[PDB]
From a paper:
To understand the molecular basis for the catalytic activity of DXO toward 5′-OH RNA, we determined the crystal structure of wild-type mouse DXO in complex with a 5′-OH hexa-nucleotide non-hydrolyzable RNA substrate mimic, OH-U(S)6. DXO crystals were soaked with OH-U(S)6 RNA and with calcium as the divalent cation to further block hydrolysis. We observed good electron density for four nucleotides of the OH-U(S)6 RNA and a calcium ion in the complex with DXO. There is electron density for a calcium ion bound to the active site residues (Asp236, Glu253 and Glu192), and this density is not observed in crystals not soaked with calcium. However, the calcium ion contacts the phosphorothioate group between the second and third nucleotides of this RNA instead of between the first and second as was observed with pU(S)6 (15). This suggests that the scissile phosphate of this 5′-OH RNA is located between its second and third nucleotides, and more importantly, it predicts that DXO generates a 5′-OH dinucleotide as the first product of the hydrolysis. The U0 base has π stacking interactions with the mostly conserved Trp131 side chain, and it also makes three hydrogen-bonding contacts: to the backbone carbonyl of Arg102 and the side chain of His105 directly and to the backbone amide of His105 through a water molecule. The 5′-OH moiety itself is intimately packed against the base of U(S)1. The presence of a phosphate here would make it impossible to adopt this conformation, which may account for why 5′-PO4 RNA cannot bind in this manner. In addition, the U(S)1 base is in the syn configuration in OH-U(S)6 RNA, while it is anti in pU(S)6.
In eukaryotes, the DXO/Rai1 family of enzymes removes numerous 5′-end RNA modifications, thereby regulating RNA turnover. Mouse DXO catalyzes the elimination of incomplete 5′-end caps (including pyrophosphate) and the non-canonical NAD+ cap on mRNAs, and possesses distributive 5′-3′ exoribonuclease activity toward 5′-monophosphate (5′-PO4) RNA. Six conserved sequence motifs (I–VI) form the active site which is located within a deep pocket, and several residues in these motifs bind divalent cations for catalysis. Here, we demonstrate that DXO also catalyzes the hydrolysis of RNAs bearing a 5′-hydroxyl group (5′-OH RNA).
Residue numbers in the entry: 27 to 384
Write the structure that this text describes.
RNA sequence: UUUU
């Protein structure tokens, strides 16, 4: 039993997707410690209007002022589960809403959305049903682990530059000014917890958020949030076209799911400076490929993700937090399923299970 | 589950 991923099978009308609502938030601090508040949220602070153009040095501080998260620590859903536990009797939707929902990280859903168009990287998703609720947690594929261990030095510095860009664009207090002199600590994260629904599948998911724009006319989250991105500067119309067809699809998927309405991109030259900023409204991204024979279609993304959720819901019949259905996908094939019990795939921790039982 |  498998699930095909070809875009032609999902070419129908755009499916129902509920306007996402923010249910709460949590922060992870410099020590990767959880706090149920917004202490890690930063505030959009672009270059002053009368000053010179941006000239952000994205390599400044590498690697002396870089404190990277330890990628061997596999946190899975743990931080989101703690939020849920601390809010289980305050969830909107009425009684038993959680029992009919699917719970995951925003980034897991992003990978589903782009699957009909992805040709390089596959994925694996572990699924467990517990008290009706379906939990989806990404598993690092063996190939992606090897790629991570063999990360080239230049790719490591480019990873730093994406985080450094945010430091040039965000301040710790509204109206404040950025401080690039500090350290880039990728243990720090602000996460928004959202409710949505795709087709008939209710969703509870969390996603890291880069910053809140206090200058935005709308200030009810998530509409006051801004997503920050970098990309290489482009000259040729063929370069812009390739950007529209590949990078923009992943920017759209990531920001559409939580309802983040703007992506602000910093374009960097070969020497590692950002000398151009451009805002991309999420709801206009598809306009750049709407009439492109090699473009992407948001309806294909969303219809496939709805089909996968229905495929997952029907495949995971047993309610058991120790049982895992592992969904595996590689480009050129369908999504396949295998069944596993206990370690290493089981991911719901006993401190969650036992508290939810009682 | 952030980055490229
Ligand atoms: O991008 C692709 C390419 C192929 N397949 C699927 O891989 C199988 C053999 O080619 C087919 O699925 P079947 O066993 O149900 O017939 C094909 O649809 C996909 O799902 N996505
Ligand atoms: Ca970002």
């Amino acid at each position: 039993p498998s699930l095909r991923t070809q875009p032609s099978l999902y070419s129908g009308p755009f499916p129902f997707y509920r306007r996402p609502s923010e249910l709460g938030c949590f922060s992870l601090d410099a020590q990767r410690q959880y706090h149920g508040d917004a202490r890690a949220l930063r505030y959009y602070s672009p270059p002053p209007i009368n000053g010179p153009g941006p000239d952000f040095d994205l390599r400044d501080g590498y690697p002396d002022r870089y404190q990277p998260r330890d990628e061997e620590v596999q946190e899975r859903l743990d931080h989101l589960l703690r939020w849920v536990l601390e809010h289980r009797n305050q969830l909107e939707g009425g009684p038993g809403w959680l029992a009919g929902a699917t719970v995951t990280w925003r980034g897991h859903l992003t990978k589903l959305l782009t699957t009909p168009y992805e040709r390089q990287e596959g994925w694996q998703l572990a699924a467990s049903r517990f008290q009706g609720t379906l939990y989806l947690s990404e598993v690092e594929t063996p190939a992606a682990r090897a790629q991570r261990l063999a990360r080239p030095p230049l790719l490591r510095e480019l990873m730093y530059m994406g985080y450094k860009f945010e430091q040039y664009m965000c301040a710790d207090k509204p109206g404040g000014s950025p401080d690039p002199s500090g350290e880039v600590n990728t243990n720090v994260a602000y996460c928004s917890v959202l409710r949505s629904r795709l087709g008939n599948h209710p969703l509870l998911f969390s996603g890291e958020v880069d910053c809140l724009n206090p200058q935005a006319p709308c200030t009810q989250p998530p509409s006051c949030y801004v997503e920050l991105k970098t990309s290489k500067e482009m000259h040729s119309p063929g370069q812009w076209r390739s950007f529209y067809r590949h990078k923009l699809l992943k920017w759209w998927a990531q920001s559409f799911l939580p309802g983040v309405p703007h992506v602000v991109a910093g374009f960097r030259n070969p020497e590692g400076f950002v000398c151009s900023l451009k805002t991309f409204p999420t709801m206009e991204m598809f306009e750049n490929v709407r009439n492109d024979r090699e473009g992407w279609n948001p309806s294909v993304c969303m219809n496939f993700c709805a089909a996968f959720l229905s495929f997952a819901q029907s495949t995971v019949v047993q309610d058991d937090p120790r049982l895992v259905h592992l969904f595996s996908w590689e480009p050129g094939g369908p999504v396949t399923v295998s069944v596993h019990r206990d370690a290493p795939y089981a991911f719901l921790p006993s401190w969650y299970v036992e508290t939810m039982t009682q």
